[PDB]
Amino acid sequence: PGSMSFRVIEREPRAQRVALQLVAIVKLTRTALLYSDPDLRRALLQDLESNEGVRVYPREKTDKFKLQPDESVNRLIEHDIRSRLGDDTVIAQSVNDIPGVWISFKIDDDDYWVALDRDQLDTVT
Amino acid sequence: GSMSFRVIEREPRAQRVALQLVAIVKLTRTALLYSDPDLRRALLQDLESNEGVRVYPREKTDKFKLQPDESVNRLIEHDIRSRLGDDTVIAQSVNDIPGVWISFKIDDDDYWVAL
């Protein structure tokens, strides 16, 4: 049980909690939409909004967005998310001047956002 | 503080494992609820392979075993049922397969999620 080190566990377990939760929301939202009945898809999207606070927007070439504040916790959360969703995942604090937690996804060649009503990326809901 | 009337001193926090399990079940149930019937096999395969979420039919003949009756488990179970419904079965095994087993229902169809 060693005395020569200096590094100790700090806040990393919380970052993992937050990240794995966000990864679940994005993956399950994508899956729900991918396999949805087209006749029920509006209802699905309303259900996600009302019961999970998840909004789905098309991701357009004309979208502007702002990256998360470059703080150490945010870097760790983002890194943990990208480990599961892919390097090219875009994670933002606002898109088209709407604040939130914004995470990109794709279905084949169609691009989307998941938008969550959260003041901070470092949030456990 | 221990004898005081402050919220933080008198009420246990929601177990994070419980709220996470709730979110997974809610989303899974949502995916299934609005799914295209011809895509339900594909959906179930994707849930298992890509999200680690295994959905099975729940049959009347299923044997299940309840979680150990310890105070933490009672609080987790209470937090799950307060969000999913009091009809929710929560089990440590179904048909002698260990796991975190949580039931849900859509119309006349009963299901398990194993995590």
PDB file of C-alpha atoms in Angstrom:
ATOM      1  CA  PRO A   1       0.000   0.000   0.000  1.00  0.00           C
ATOM      2  CA  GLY A   2       2.304   2.682  -1.425  1.00  0.00           C
ATOM      3  CA  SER A   3       3.774   5.962  -0.061  1.00  0.00           C
ATOM      4  CA  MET A   4       5.940   7.136  -3.070  1.00  0.00           C
ATOM      5  CA  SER A   5       3.032   8.363  -5.270  1.00  0.00           C
ATOM      6  CA  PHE A   6       1.194  11.658  -5.097  1.00  0.00           C
ATOM      7  CA  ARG A   7      -1.885  11.301  -7.302  1.00  0.00           C
ATOM      8  CA  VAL A   8      -5.149  10.271  -5.491  1.00  0.00           C
ATOM      9  CA  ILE A   9      -8.733   9.798  -6.670  1.00  0.00           C
ATOM     10  CA  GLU A  10     -10.439  13.188  -6.883  1.00  0.00           C
ATOM     11  CA  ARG A  11     -13.664  13.815  -8.847  1.00  0.00           C
ATOM     12  CA  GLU A  12     -13.203  11.366 -11.678  1.00  0.00           C
ATOM     13  CA  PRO A  13     -15.944   8.870 -10.454  1.00  0.00           C
ATOM     14  CA  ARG A  14     -18.526  11.646 -10.723  1.00  0.00           C
ATOM     15  CA  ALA A  15     -17.412  12.485 -14.249  1.00  0.00           C
ATOM     16  CA  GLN A  16     -17.959   8.826 -15.176  1.00  0.00           C
ATOM     17  CA  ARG A  17     -21.463   8.880 -13.661  1.00  0.00           C
ATOM     18  CA  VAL A  18     -22.398  11.958 -15.640  1.00  0.00           C
ATOM     19  CA  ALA A  19     -20.892  10.677 -18.831  1.00  0.00           C
ATOM     20  CA  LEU A  20     -22.409   7.208 -18.715  1.00  0.00           C
ATOM     21  CA  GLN A  21     -25.783   8.816 -18.095  1.00  0.00           C
ATOM     22  CA  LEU A  22     -25.493  11.121 -21.031  1.00  0.00           C
ATOM     23  CA  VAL A  23     -24.248   8.272 -23.223  1.00  0.00           C
ATOM     24  CA  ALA A  24     -27.351   6.227 -22.223  1.00  0.00           C
ATOM     25  CA  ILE A  25     -29.697   9.080 -23.113  1.00  0.00           C
ATOM     26  CA  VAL A  26     -28.119   9.606 -26.504  1.00  0.00           C
ATOM     27  CA  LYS A  27     -27.855   5.937 -27.426  1.00  0.00           C
ATOM     28  CA  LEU A  28     -31.393   5.049 -26.288  1.00  0.00           C
ATOM     29  CA  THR A  29     -32.901   8.164 -27.914  1.00  0.00           C
ATOM     30  CA  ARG A  30     -31.164   7.284 -31.198  1.00  0.00           C
ATOM     31  CA  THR A  31     -32.336   3.656 -30.919  1.00  0.00           C
ATOM     32  CA  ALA A  32     -35.908   4.705 -30.163  1.00  0.00           C
ATOM     33  CA  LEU A  33     -35.986   6.974 -33.251  1.00  0.00           C
ATOM     34  CA  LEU A  34     -34.189   4.476 -35.521  1.00  0.00           C
ATOM     35  CA  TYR A  35     -36.671   1.675 -34.935  1.00  0.00           C
ATOM     36  CA  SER A  36     -39.773   3.869 -34.604  1.00  0.00           C
ATOM     37  CA  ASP A  37     -43.049   3.485 -36.511  1.00  0.00           C
ATOM     38  CA  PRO A  38     -43.309   6.535 -38.749  1.00  0.00           C
ATOM     39  CA  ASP A  39     -47.008   6.971 -37.801  1.00  0.00           C
ATOM     40  CA  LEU A  40     -46.045   7.136 -34.131  1.00  0.00           C
ATOM     41  CA  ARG A  41     -42.880   9.173 -34.428  1.00  0.00           C
ATOM     42  CA  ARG A  42     -44.358  12.521 -33.419  1.00  0.00           C
ATOM     43  CA  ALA A  43     -45.832  10.865 -30.344  1.00  0.00           C
ATOM     44  CA  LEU A  44     -42.447   9.290 -29.581  1.00  0.00           C
ATOM     45  CA  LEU A  45     -40.727  12.649 -29.791  1.00  0.00           C
ATOM     46  CA  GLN A  46     -43.351  14.257 -27.543  1.00  0.00           C
ATOM     47  CA  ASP A  47     -42.958  11.436 -25.024  1.00  0.00           C
ATOM     48  CA  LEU A  48     -39.163  11.901 -24.943  1.00  0.00           C
ATOM     49  CA  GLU A  49     -39.616  15.647 -24.373  1.00  0.00           C
ATOM     50  CA  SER A  50     -42.233  15.338 -21.643  1.00  0.00           C
ATOM     51  CA  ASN A  51     -40.908  12.333 -19.691  1.00  0.00           C
ATOM     52  CA  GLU A  52     -37.160  12.472 -20.205  1.00  0.00           C
ATOM     53  CA  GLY A  53     -36.553  16.133 -21.125  1.00  0.00           C
ATOM     54  CA  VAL A  54     -34.979  15.075 -24.372  1.00  0.00           C
ATOM     55  CA  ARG A  55     -35.431  17.227 -27.516  1.00  0.00           C
ATOM     56  CA  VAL A  56     -34.227  16.058 -30.912  1.00  0.00           C
ATOM     57  CA  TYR A  57     -33.207  18.640 -33.515  1.00  0.00           C
ATOM     58  CA  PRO A  58     -31.908  18.166 -37.006  1.00  0.00           C
ATOM     59  CA  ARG A  59     -28.292  19.096 -37.234  1.00  0.00           C
ATOM     60  CA  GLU A  60     -27.806  21.445 -40.152  1.00  0.00           C
ATOM     61  CA  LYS A  61     -24.729  22.734 -41.995  1.00  0.00           C
ATOM     62  CA  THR A  62     -25.810  26.251 -41.045  1.00  0.00           C
ATOM     63  CA  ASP A  63     -25.856  25.488 -37.262  1.00  0.00           C
ATOM     64  CA  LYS A  64     -23.678  27.630 -35.025  1.00  0.00           C
ATOM     65  CA  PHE A  65     -22.596  26.237 -31.685  1.00  0.00           C
ATOM     66  CA  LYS A  66     -20.452  27.013 -28.678  1.00  0.00           C
ATOM     67  CA  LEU A  67     -18.225  24.475 -27.012  1.00  0.00           C
ATOM     68  CA  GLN A  68     -18.435  23.788 -23.297  1.00  0.00           C
ATOM     69  CA  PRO A  69     -16.322  25.928 -20.920  1.00  0.00           C
ATOM     70  CA  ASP A  70     -12.779  24.600 -21.071  1.00  0.00           C
ATOM     71  CA  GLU A  71     -12.590  23.463 -17.427  1.00  0.00           C
ATOM     72  CA  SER A  72     -10.944  20.222 -16.284  1.00  0.00           C
ATOM     73  CA  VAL A  73     -14.203  18.474 -15.266  1.00  0.00           C
ATOM     74  CA  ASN A  74     -15.774  19.247 -18.647  1.00  0.00           C
ATOM     75  CA  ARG A  75     -12.769  17.853 -20.493  1.00  0.00           C
ATOM     76  CA  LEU A  76     -13.004  14.621 -18.519  1.00  0.00           C
ATOM     77  CA  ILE A  77     -16.757  14.274 -19.026  1.00  0.00           C
ATOM     78  CA  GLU A  78     -16.349  14.947 -22.753  1.00  0.00           C
ATOM     79  CA  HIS A  79     -13.545  12.458 -22.990  1.00  0.00           C
ATOM     80  CA  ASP A  80     -15.583   9.813 -21.240  1.00  0.00           C
ATOM     81  CA  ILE A  81     -18.577  10.486 -23.574  1.00  0.00           C
ATOM     82  CA  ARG A  82     -16.423  10.297 -26.718  1.00  0.00           C
ATOM     83  CA  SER A  83     -14.899   7.004 -25.541  1.00  0.00           C
ATOM     84  CA  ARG A  84     -18.396   5.492 -25.915  1.00  0.00           C
ATOM     85  CA  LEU A  85     -20.022   7.575 -28.734  1.00  0.00           C
ATOM     86  CA  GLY A  86     -17.042   8.285 -31.010  1.00  0.00           C
ATOM     87  CA  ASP A  87     -14.315  10.921 -31.435  1.00  0.00           C
ATOM     88  CA  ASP A  88     -16.344  13.039 -33.863  1.00  0.00           C
ATOM     89  CA  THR A  89     -19.212  13.540 -31.359  1.00  0.00           C
ATOM     90  CA  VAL A  90     -19.925  17.194 -30.998  1.00  0.00           C
ATOM     91  CA  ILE A  91     -20.725  18.342 -27.451  1.00  0.00           C
ATOM     92  CA  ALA A  92     -21.836  21.950 -26.939  1.00  0.00           C
ATOM     93  CA  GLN A  93     -23.261  24.385 -24.394  1.00  0.00           C
ATOM     94  CA  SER A  94     -25.474  26.043 -26.941  1.00  0.00           C
ATOM     95  CA  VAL A  95     -26.563  25.529 -30.504  1.00  0.00           C
ATOM     96  CA  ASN A  96     -28.058  28.347 -32.587  1.00  0.00           C
ATOM     97  CA  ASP A  97     -28.133  30.485 -29.469  1.00  0.00           C
ATOM     98  CA  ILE A  98     -30.113  28.034 -27.362  1.00  0.00           C
ATOM     99  CA  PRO A  99     -28.351  27.046 -24.129  1.00  0.00           C
ATOM    100  CA  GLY A 100     -28.429  23.426 -22.996  1.00  0.00           C
ATOM    101  CA  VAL A 101     -26.414  20.259 -23.132  1.00  0.00           C
ATOM    102  CA  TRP A 102     -26.170  19.422 -26.823  1.00  0.00           C
ATOM    103  CA  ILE A 103     -24.761  16.130 -28.118  1.00  0.00           C
ATOM    104  CA  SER A 104     -24.661  15.120 -31.768  1.00  0.00           C
ATOM    105  CA  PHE A 105     -25.579  11.722 -33.280  1.00  0.00           C
ATOM    106  CA  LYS A 106     -26.202  10.244 -36.705  1.00  0.00           C
ATOM    107  CA  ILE A 107     -28.552   7.792 -38.334  1.00  0.00           C
ATOM    108  CA  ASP A 108     -26.714   6.636 -41.422  1.00  0.00           C
ATOM    109  CA  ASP A 109     -25.894   9.928 -43.213  1.00  0.00           C
ATOM    110  CA  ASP A 110     -28.570  12.006 -41.374  1.00  0.00           C
ATOM    111  CA  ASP A 111     -27.280  14.213 -38.525  1.00  0.00           C
ATOM    112  CA  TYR A 112     -29.119  15.134 -35.340  1.00  0.00           C
ATOM    113  CA  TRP A 113     -28.758  16.713 -31.968  1.00  0.00           C
ATOM    114  CA  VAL A 114     -29.944  15.616 -28.605  1.00  0.00           C
ATOM    115  CA  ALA A 115     -30.708  18.734 -26.536  1.00  0.00           C
ATOM    116  CA  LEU A 116     -31.113  18.550 -22.750  1.00  0.00           C
ATOM    117  CA  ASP A 117     -32.312  21.339 -20.431  1.00  0.00           C
ATOM    118  CA  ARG A 118     -29.301  21.399 -18.144  1.00  0.00           C
ATOM    119  CA  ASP A 119     -27.408  24.430 -16.843  1.00  0.00           C
ATOM    120  CA  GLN A 120     -24.152  22.483 -16.641  1.00  0.00           C
ATOM    121  CA  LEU A 121     -22.602  19.540 -18.440  1.00  0.00           C
ATOM    122  CA  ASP A 122     -21.551  18.338 -14.953  1.00  0.00           C
ATOM    123  CA  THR A 123     -25.072  17.364 -13.935  1.00  0.00           C
ATOM    124  CA  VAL A 124     -26.558  14.283 -12.491  1.00  0.00           C
ATOM    125  CA  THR A 125     -30.318  14.100 -13.109  1.00  0.00           C
TER     126      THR A 125
ATOM    127  CA  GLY B   1     -26.981  18.729  12.952  1.00  0.00           C
ATOM    128  CA  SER B   2     -28.050  15.104  13.520  1.00  0.00           C
ATOM    129  CA  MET B   3     -31.063  16.126  15.653  1.00  0.00           C
ATOM    130  CA  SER B   4     -31.862  19.206  13.558  1.00  0.00           C
ATOM    131  CA  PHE B   5     -34.774  19.694  11.224  1.00  0.00           C
ATOM    132  CA  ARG B   6     -32.671  20.469   8.091  1.00  0.00           C
ATOM    133  CA  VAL B   7     -33.683  18.584   4.892  1.00  0.00           C
ATOM    134  CA  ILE B   8     -30.165  17.275   4.371  1.00  0.00           C
ATOM    135  CA  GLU B   9     -30.203  15.901   7.950  1.00  0.00           C
ATOM    136  CA  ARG B  10     -33.644  14.236   7.803  1.00  0.00           C
ATOM    137  CA  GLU B  11     -34.193  12.808   4.281  1.00  0.00           C
ATOM    138  CA  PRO B  12     -32.112  10.271   2.392  1.00  0.00           C
ATOM    139  CA  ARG B  13     -31.033  11.252  -1.070  1.00  0.00           C
ATOM    140  CA  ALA B  14     -32.301   9.313  -4.069  1.00  0.00           C
ATOM    141  CA  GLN B  15     -29.955   6.431  -4.798  1.00  0.00           C
ATOM    142  CA  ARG B  16     -28.154   7.276  -8.061  1.00  0.00           C
ATOM    143  CA  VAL B  17     -28.156   3.664  -9.125  1.00  0.00           C
ATOM    144  CA  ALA B  18     -32.005   3.775  -8.790  1.00  0.00           C
ATOM    145  CA  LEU B  19     -32.465   6.933 -10.879  1.00  0.00           C
ATOM    146  CA  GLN B  20     -30.163   5.549 -13.523  1.00  0.00           C
ATOM    147  CA  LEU B  21     -32.026   2.252 -13.666  1.00  0.00           C
ATOM    148  CA  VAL B  22     -35.276   4.212 -13.928  1.00  0.00           C
ATOM    149  CA  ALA B  23     -33.984   6.241 -16.829  1.00  0.00           C
ATOM    150  CA  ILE B  24     -32.797   3.114 -18.665  1.00  0.00           C
ATOM    151  CA  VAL B  25     -36.146   1.331 -18.175  1.00  0.00           C
ATOM    152  CA  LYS B  26     -38.182   4.404 -19.166  1.00  0.00           C
ATOM    153  CA  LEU B  27     -36.171   4.890 -22.341  1.00  0.00           C
ATOM    154  CA  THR B  28     -36.209   1.228 -23.215  1.00  0.00           C
ATOM    155  CA  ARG B  29     -39.984   1.024 -22.667  1.00  0.00           C
ATOM    156  CA  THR B  30     -40.364   4.164 -24.840  1.00  0.00           C
ATOM    157  CA  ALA B  31     -38.304   2.621 -27.642  1.00  0.00           C
ATOM    158  CA  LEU B  32     -40.471  -0.489 -27.580  1.00  0.00           C
ATOM    159  CA  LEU B  33     -43.782   1.417 -27.212  1.00  0.00           C
ATOM    160  CA  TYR B  34     -43.331   3.399 -30.398  1.00  0.00           C
ATOM    161  CA  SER B  35     -41.416   0.758 -32.384  1.00  0.00           C
ATOM    162  CA  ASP B  36     -42.355  -0.475 -35.818  1.00  0.00           C
ATOM    163  CA  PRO B  37     -43.584  -4.051 -35.433  1.00  0.00           C
ATOM    164  CA  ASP B  38     -41.328  -5.261 -38.277  1.00  0.00           C
ATOM    165  CA  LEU B  39     -38.339  -3.720 -36.524  1.00  0.00           C
ATOM    166  CA  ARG B  40     -38.905  -5.124 -33.087  1.00  0.00           C
ATOM    167  CA  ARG B  41     -36.397  -7.964 -33.529  1.00  0.00           C
ATOM    168  CA  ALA B  42     -33.812  -5.473 -34.790  1.00  0.00           C
ATOM    169  CA  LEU B  43     -34.575  -3.151 -31.893  1.00  0.00           C
ATOM    170  CA  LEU B  44     -34.124  -5.890 -29.317  1.00  0.00           C
ATOM    171  CA  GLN B  45     -30.842  -6.931 -30.925  1.00  0.00           C
ATOM    172  CA  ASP B  46     -29.548  -3.393 -30.963  1.00  0.00           C
ATOM    173  CA  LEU B  47     -30.498  -2.880 -27.287  1.00  0.00           C
ATOM    174  CA  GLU B  48     -28.541  -5.964 -26.277  1.00  0.00           C
ATOM    175  CA  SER B  49     -25.504  -5.518 -28.479  1.00  0.00           C
ATOM    176  CA  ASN B  50     -25.008  -1.778 -28.327  1.00  0.00           C
ATOM    177  CA  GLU B  51     -26.634  -0.647 -25.059  1.00  0.00           C
ATOM    178  CA  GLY B  52     -26.248  -3.767 -22.894  1.00  0.00           C
ATOM    179  CA  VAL B  53     -29.948  -3.744 -22.321  1.00  0.00           C
ATOM    180  CA  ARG B  54     -31.533  -7.166 -22.573  1.00  0.00           C
ATOM    181  CA  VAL B  55     -35.287  -7.276 -23.023  1.00  0.00           C
ATOM    182  CA  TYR B  56     -37.236 -10.523 -22.716  1.00  0.00           C
ATOM    183  CA  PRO B  57     -40.902 -11.430 -22.603  1.00  0.00           C
ATOM    184  CA  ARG B  58     -42.236 -11.919 -19.080  1.00  0.00           C
ATOM    185  CA  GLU B  59     -44.296 -15.098 -18.850  1.00  0.00           C
ATOM    186  CA  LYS B  60     -46.821 -16.177 -16.188  1.00  0.00           C
ATOM    187  CA  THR B  61     -44.673 -19.256 -15.562  1.00  0.00           C
ATOM    188  CA  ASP B  62     -41.440 -17.355 -14.855  1.00  0.00           C
ATOM    189  CA  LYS B  63     -39.750 -18.076 -11.555  1.00  0.00           C
ATOM    190  CA  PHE B  64     -38.160 -14.979 -10.037  1.00  0.00           C
ATOM    191  CA  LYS B  65     -36.265 -14.299  -6.793  1.00  0.00           C
ATOM    192  CA  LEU B  66     -36.457 -10.968  -4.875  1.00  0.00           C
ATOM    193  CA  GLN B  67     -33.482  -8.819  -3.869  1.00  0.00           C
ATOM    194  CA  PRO B  68     -31.956  -9.331  -0.380  1.00  0.00           C
ATOM    195  CA  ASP B  69     -34.097  -7.522   2.211  1.00  0.00           C
ATOM    196  CA  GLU B  70     -31.510  -4.958   3.365  1.00  0.00           C
ATOM    197  CA  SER B  71     -32.244  -1.286   4.079  1.00  0.00           C
ATOM    198  CA  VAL B  72     -30.295   0.027   1.056  1.00  0.00           C
ATOM    199  CA  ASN B  73     -32.188  -2.332  -1.273  1.00  0.00           C
ATOM    200  CA  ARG B  74     -35.527  -1.250   0.146  1.00  0.00           C
ATOM    201  CA  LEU B  75     -34.603   2.408  -0.537  1.00  0.00           C
ATOM    202  CA  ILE B  76     -33.410   1.650  -4.096  1.00  0.00           C
ATOM    203  CA  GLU B  77     -36.577  -0.357  -4.747  1.00  0.00           C
ATOM    204  CA  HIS B  78     -38.735   2.374  -3.368  1.00  0.00           C
ATOM    205  CA  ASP B  79     -37.058   4.990  -5.501  1.00  0.00           C
ATOM    206  CA  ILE B  80     -37.511   2.748  -8.602  1.00  0.00           C
ATOM    207  CA  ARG B  81     -41.189   2.072  -7.928  1.00  0.00           C
ATOM    208  CA  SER B  82     -41.951   5.708  -7.140  1.00  0.00           C
ATOM    209  CA  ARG B  83     -40.906   6.482 -10.740  1.00  0.00           C
ATOM    210  CA  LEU B  84     -41.898   3.309 -12.664  1.00  0.00           C
ATOM    211  CA  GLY B  85     -45.042   2.279 -10.797  1.00  0.00           C
ATOM    212  CA  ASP B  86     -45.901   0.083  -7.826  1.00  0.00           C
ATOM    213  CA  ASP B  87     -46.580  -2.903 -10.179  1.00  0.00           C
ATOM    214  CA  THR B  88     -42.840  -3.006 -10.981  1.00  0.00           C
ATOM    215  CA  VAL B  89     -41.200  -6.304 -10.090  1.00  0.00           C
ATOM    216  CA  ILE B  90     -37.558  -6.017  -9.155  1.00  0.00           C
ATOM    217  CA  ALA B  91     -35.612  -9.288  -8.877  1.00  0.00           C
ATOM    218  CA  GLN B  92     -32.087 -10.646  -8.507  1.00  0.00           C
ATOM    219  CA  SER B  93     -32.844 -13.574 -10.823  1.00  0.00           C
ATOM    220  CA  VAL B  94     -35.446 -14.776 -13.319  1.00  0.00           C
ATOM    221  CA  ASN B  95     -35.588 -18.505 -14.218  1.00  0.00           C
ATOM    222  CA  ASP B  96     -32.370 -18.913 -12.246  1.00  0.00           C
ATOM    223  CA  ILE B  97     -30.443 -16.385 -14.302  1.00  0.00           C
ATOM    224  CA  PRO B  98     -28.848 -13.751 -12.037  1.00  0.00           C
ATOM    225  CA  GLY B  99     -29.011 -10.055 -12.954  1.00  0.00           C
ATOM    226  CA  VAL B 100     -30.758  -6.791 -12.201  1.00  0.00           C
ATOM    227  CA  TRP B 101     -34.255  -7.651 -13.406  1.00  0.00           C
ATOM    228  CA  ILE B 102     -36.974  -5.053 -13.670  1.00  0.00           C
ATOM    229  CA  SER B 103     -40.440  -5.639 -15.157  1.00  0.00           C
ATOM    230  CA  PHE B 104     -42.536  -3.352 -17.377  1.00  0.00           C
ATOM    231  CA  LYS B 105     -45.700  -3.719 -19.383  1.00  0.00           C
ATOM    232  CA  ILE B 106     -47.076  -2.444 -22.695  1.00  0.00           C
ATOM    233  CA  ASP B 107     -50.830  -3.050 -23.187  1.00  0.00           C
ATOM    234  CA  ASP B 108     -51.299  -6.856 -22.887  1.00  0.00           C
ATOM    235  CA  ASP B 109     -47.562  -7.611 -23.123  1.00  0.00           C
ATOM    236  CA  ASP B 110     -45.361  -8.010 -20.027  1.00  0.00           C
ATOM    237  CA  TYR B 111     -41.577  -7.699 -20.284  1.00  0.00           C
ATOM    238  CA  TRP B 112     -38.352  -7.928 -18.359  1.00  0.00           C
ATOM    239  CA  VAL B 113     -35.297  -5.710 -18.680  1.00  0.00           C
ATOM    240  CA  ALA B 114     -32.138  -7.449 -17.467  1.00  0.00           C
ATOM    241  CA  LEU B 115     -29.126  -5.246 -16.655  1.00  0.00           C
TER     242      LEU B 115
END
